[PDB]
């Protein structure tokens, strides 16, 4: 036993678990697959534009309690995300301004849009976040797809669409490939879509003035930058009754307990001896990652805020993207950012890189003026082909798995413990989740150490 606990994966989740066990006084060792310490939390302060840049997650939610504390104690300083102005909606190619986040009640689609939204939150509430697979009608629910449900519950094609877009960007998938039960679950465990869809508050409420990968770096620096072995891809795990043996090719390590902090899909790439119980086996073998693009355009001035727009945008057909401002007071030049996922990623990944960029800039132009036509910096980062993330923004599920293996999302197997945002009780999918998941995992192993 080289160390007490070896944490596989250096995401905010693995890092949170590391700092947790370390502060508790246990010997810790974090093993990373590639050469950078963040996870789906990727930062570059050397960033070609005027300010550090995040290629991964970066928004902090107002109820993101654990993340705020962790990073704040680490010395990081937050900053407001939201921007003053009208949010924009492009429904069926038409540009609609929403003052006070509110859309003209007279528009024909708004009413059913407001109703279907509530209807969703209700469904989400009927199945919690604790025992979704056990809720009053899980089985039934995990049989339909968010697609067929929208079909069975919404008349308007636009309401149907802007619902679809929401799913696609919020998850990395399209409603036609996502369990209805799994979505109600997600909406529920992230405190409703109103919270999930906020642009000023809710989940999108603030940033780490400095970059999001910092929580993991600062933890690394504190706990001991040498306790992180980068480029140590784990490919096999002998997990028996006295401890666990990790293998990175011919290389190997051993600890009493290990916490595997990553997405279920990413973990399925690792061989287990003995085999994992069919329950978890199925879960990490049938829980895919979304498909996603993170696009960013940088300009000299925030011509959108300065023209009365928040920079927030929801487009159902031109491109199929959610748009948000990313201009922190510190940055030298303004930055607008969009997210293309699911079937939208699909359609666009089909074109050339430049074809995509213009499609994006064209959208920006028709939404905030001609000043968007010629940006100072433009970058896109495809995540569906990322070596280790292997996917979109979060994990998602097709009909038939959450209801029958969801439990495996959390339960340990011998000395192997599961961390990673997807293991959190709440906010599984967001950073908050990664932190909690990893702290929960640690708390568990710490108690296992005192016998
Ligand atoms: C474009 C994008 C934008 C996002 N925006 C937000 C946002 O605004 N707010 C928010 O809250 N969340 C956001 N997220 C989600 C957030 O990034 C995740 O919830 C969080 O980073 C998950 O953390 P994790 O530590 O569980 O996993 P990861 O960050 O995926 O880290 C797992 C680690 O495991 C390593 N690993 C994988 N396989 C192996 C192996 N075999 N051996 C060793 N190491 C391995 C990986 O290299 C990686 O570093 C976003 C995600 C994306 C993709």
Residue numbers in the entry: 30 to 480
Task: Pull verbatim passages from the article behind this deposition.
Originally described in B. oxydans strain IH-35A, CHAO carries out the initial step in the biodegradation pathway of cyclohexylamine, a high volume chemical used industrially as a corrosion inhibitor and in the rubber and water treatment industries. The CHAO structure can be divided into two domains: a cofactor-binding domain composed of two four-stranded β-sheets (one parallel, one mixed) and seven α-helices, and a substrate-binding domain consisting of a twisted seven-stranded mixed β-sheet and eight α-helices. The active site of CHAO is located in a buried cavity located at the interface of the substrate- and cofactor-binding domains. An examination of the three dimensional atomic structure of CHAO reveals that the overall fold is substantially similar to that of the human MAO B monomer, with a RMSD of 1.1 Å for the coordinates of the α-carbon atoms.
In order to determine the holoenzyme structure of CHAO, we employed molecular replacement using the A chain from human MAO B (30% sequence identity), truncated to remove the C-terminal predicted transmembrane helical segment, as a search model. Four molecules of CHAO were identified per asymmetric unit. Most of the polypeptide chain could be modeled into the electron density maps: residues 30–480 in the case of the holoenzyme and residues 30–478 in the ternary complex. For the apoenzyme structure, 90% of the residues fall into the favored region of a Ramachandran plot and 2.2% are outliers. When superimposed, the structures of CHAO crystallized with and without substrate present are very similar (RMSD 0.26 Å), with no significant differences in the positioning of secondary structural elements and with only minor differences in the conformation of loop regions. The structures of the CHAO holoenzyme and complex with cyclohexanone are remarkably similar, suggesting that there are no significant conformational changes associated with the binding of product in the active site. One side of this cavity is occupied by the flavin cofactor, held in place by hydrogen bonds and Van der Waals interactions with the protein. The isoalloxazine ring of the FAD cofactor is planar, and a lysine residue that is hydrogen bonded to the N5 atom of FAD in other MAOs (via a water molecule) is positioned to play that role in CHAO. In addition to the substrate-binding cavity, CHAO has a second cavity located closer to the protein surface that is shielded from the bulk solvent by a loop of the polypeptide chain (residues 128–138). This intermediate cavity is separated from the substrate-binding cavity by a series of amino acid side chains (T198, L199, M226, and F351).
